[PDB]
């Protein structure tokens, strides 16, 4: 892996930013690998999370947020267009009202902001992947 | 322009980071346009500058740094492989001992760190360009 995992990246996010994550699952899909992305409001892992994203490859995605230290109401989708054993490109685009999640160019979900995305100061990419690159673009 | 100019981007830089700047000069080369990139240590424009970069299109590049508010010894190169009127790609790659400057895939200079690049908290892109995109990658 080009970058260590858990990869904790300090970020500054604004409307129009894109977080592009490129990596490869480290286990085949029959082994139920996961990929987790957390939009943290501080480098401390107990800080609030504006957007939590856990892909269960070949299964579903679970999304949530943590406010005043409390996990809020979980959201899910079954649209998991990741391919077994291949590199993926995961793009999280910050619109004025939501994070748009695109997997390999395919939009799968729009997670609405309950706090402004400019409150995000760290993005952590974790779990069962090898990372080739992470870019924050505007 | 997709992004306003002067564009002041909060950043976090580490060894292995790449700053990729894509834009177009807003004047023809006979009009002596410039492109300036400042690696600032804080959002305040009077803060120290780890790496200052001013392209005089069709002419030369001037580089310097500002320490304790004082401009240090200026460095220059004549290698300015920008094309008149075209979009450029300016990549600044942070190695352990230097910033590598690549213009349109062409390495033109290596500006050695006199403070650690992790001290850079803001990158400002300014002067005679229209910006299509700025990405910070690892």
PDB file of N, CA and C in Angstrom, chain A residues 3 7 9-10 12 132-138, chain B residues 3 7 9-10 12 132-138:
ATOM      1  N   UNK A   3      -0.028   4.206   1.051  1.00  0.00           N
ATOM      2  CA  UNK A   3      -0.321   4.963   2.254  1.00  0.00           C
ATOM      3  C   UNK A   3      -0.717   4.020   3.378  1.00  0.00           C
ATOM      4  N   UNK A   7      -5.510   5.447   7.453  1.00  0.00           N
ATOM      5  CA  UNK A   7      -4.910   6.657   6.911  1.00  0.00           C
ATOM      6  C   UNK A   7      -5.701   7.847   7.441  1.00  0.00           C
ATOM      7  N   UNK A   9      -5.991  11.712   7.279  1.00  0.00           N
ATOM      8  CA  UNK A   9      -5.533  12.840   6.478  1.00  0.00           C
ATOM      9  C   UNK A   9      -6.142  14.130   6.994  1.00  0.00           C
ATOM     10  N   UNK A  10      -5.345  15.095   7.449  1.00  0.00           N
ATOM     11  CA  UNK A  10      -5.900  16.425   7.725  1.00  0.00           C
ATOM     12  C   UNK A  10      -6.447  17.031   6.444  1.00  0.00           C
ATOM     13  N   UNK A  12      -9.164  20.310   4.710  1.00  0.00           N
ATOM     14  CA  UNK A  12     -10.087  21.434   4.787  1.00  0.00           C
ATOM     15  C   UNK A  12     -11.087  21.256   3.659  1.00  0.00           C
ATOM     16  N   UNK A 132      -3.879   3.321  -2.945  1.00  0.00           N
ATOM     17  CA  UNK A 132      -2.895   3.822  -3.888  1.00  0.00           C
ATOM     18  C   UNK A 132      -2.777   5.335  -3.819  1.00  0.00           C
ATOM     19  N   UNK A 133      -3.893   6.038  -3.627  1.00  0.00           N
ATOM     20  CA  UNK A 133      -3.831   7.491  -3.577  1.00  0.00           C
ATOM     21  C   UNK A 133      -5.090   8.060  -2.939  1.00  0.00           C
ATOM     22  N   UNK A 134      -4.925   9.228  -2.323  1.00  0.00           N
ATOM     23  CA  UNK A 134      -6.029  10.048  -1.834  1.00  0.00           C
ATOM     24  C   UNK A 134      -5.750  11.487  -2.235  1.00  0.00           C
ATOM     25  N   UNK A 135      -6.722  12.126  -2.889  1.00  0.00           N
ATOM     26  CA  UNK A 135      -6.614  13.505  -3.357  1.00  0.00           C
ATOM     27  C   UNK A 135      -7.805  14.307  -2.861  1.00  0.00           C
ATOM     28  N   UNK A 136      -7.551  15.543  -2.455  1.00  0.00           N
ATOM     29  CA  UNK A 136      -8.603  16.503  -2.147  1.00  0.00           C
ATOM     30  C   UNK A 136      -8.493  17.612  -3.179  1.00  0.00           C
ATOM     31  N   UNK A 137      -9.528  17.753  -4.005  1.00  0.00           N
ATOM     32  CA  UNK A 137      -9.524  18.655  -5.144  1.00  0.00           C
ATOM     33  C   UNK A 137     -10.606  19.714  -5.000  1.00  0.00           C
ATOM     34  N   UNK A 138     -10.380  20.855  -5.648  1.00  0.00           N
ATOM     35  CA  UNK A 138     -11.414  21.874  -5.817  1.00  0.00           C
ATOM     36  C   UNK A 138     -11.356  22.409  -7.239  1.00  0.00           C
TER      37      UNK A 138
ATOM     38  N   UNK B   3     -12.250  28.720  -9.949  1.00  0.00           N
ATOM     39  CA  UNK B   3     -11.897  29.136  -8.603  1.00  0.00           C
ATOM     40  C   UNK B   3     -11.475  30.596  -8.605  1.00  0.00           C
ATOM     41  N   UNK B   7      -6.504  32.677  -5.059  1.00  0.00           N
ATOM     42  CA  UNK B   7      -7.103  31.489  -4.469  1.00  0.00           C
ATOM     43  C   UNK B   7      -6.271  31.104  -3.252  1.00  0.00           C
ATOM     44  N   UNK B   9      -5.919  28.462  -0.433  1.00  0.00           N
ATOM     45  CA  UNK B   9      -6.387  27.128  -0.079  1.00  0.00           C
ATOM     46  C   UNK B   9      -5.736  26.670   1.212  1.00  0.00           C
ATOM     47  N   UNK B  10      -6.497  26.402   2.270  1.00  0.00           N
ATOM     48  CA  UNK B  10      -5.909  25.736   3.439  1.00  0.00           C
ATOM     49  C   UNK B  10      -5.401  24.360   3.046  1.00  0.00           C
ATOM     50  N   UNK B  12      -2.695  20.862   4.305  1.00  0.00           N
ATOM     51  CA  UNK B  12      -1.750  20.173   5.172  1.00  0.00           C
ATOM     52  C   UNK B  12      -0.798  19.415   4.266  1.00  0.00           C
ATOM     53  N   UNK B 132      -8.572  26.193 -13.365  1.00  0.00           N
ATOM     54  CA  UNK B 132      -9.583  25.169 -13.558  1.00  0.00           C
ATOM     55  C   UNK B 132      -9.671  24.239 -12.360  1.00  0.00           C
ATOM     56  N   UNK B 133      -8.536  23.908 -11.745  1.00  0.00           N
ATOM     57  CA  UNK B 133      -8.570  23.002 -10.607  1.00  0.00           C
ATOM     58  C   UNK B 133      -7.278  23.094  -9.808  1.00  0.00           C
ATOM     59  N   UNK B 134      -7.398  22.805  -8.515  1.00  0.00           N
ATOM     60  CA  UNK B 134      -6.261  22.623  -7.618  1.00  0.00           C
ATOM     61  C   UNK B 134      -6.530  21.388  -6.774  1.00  0.00           C
ATOM     62  N   UNK B 135      -5.573  20.458  -6.752  1.00  0.00           N
ATOM     63  CA  UNK B 135      -5.675  19.208  -6.004  1.00  0.00           C
ATOM     64  C   UNK B 135      -4.451  19.042  -5.119  1.00  0.00           C
ATOM     65  N   UNK B 136      -4.668  18.550  -3.907  1.00  0.00           N
ATOM     66  CA  UNK B 136      -3.588  18.141  -3.018  1.00  0.00           C
ATOM     67  C   UNK B 136      -3.717  16.639  -2.842  1.00  0.00           C
ATOM     68  N   UNK B 137      -2.712  15.902  -3.312  1.00  0.00           N
ATOM     69  CA  UNK B 137      -2.745  14.450  -3.366  1.00  0.00           C
ATOM     70  C   UNK B 137      -1.639  13.851  -2.510  1.00  0.00           C
ATOM     71  N   UNK B 138      -1.869  12.621  -2.057  1.00  0.00           N
ATOM     72  CA  UNK B 138      -0.825  11.812  -1.432  1.00  0.00           C
ATOM     73  C   UNK B 138      -0.928  10.385  -1.948  1.00  0.00           C
TER      74      UNK B 138
END
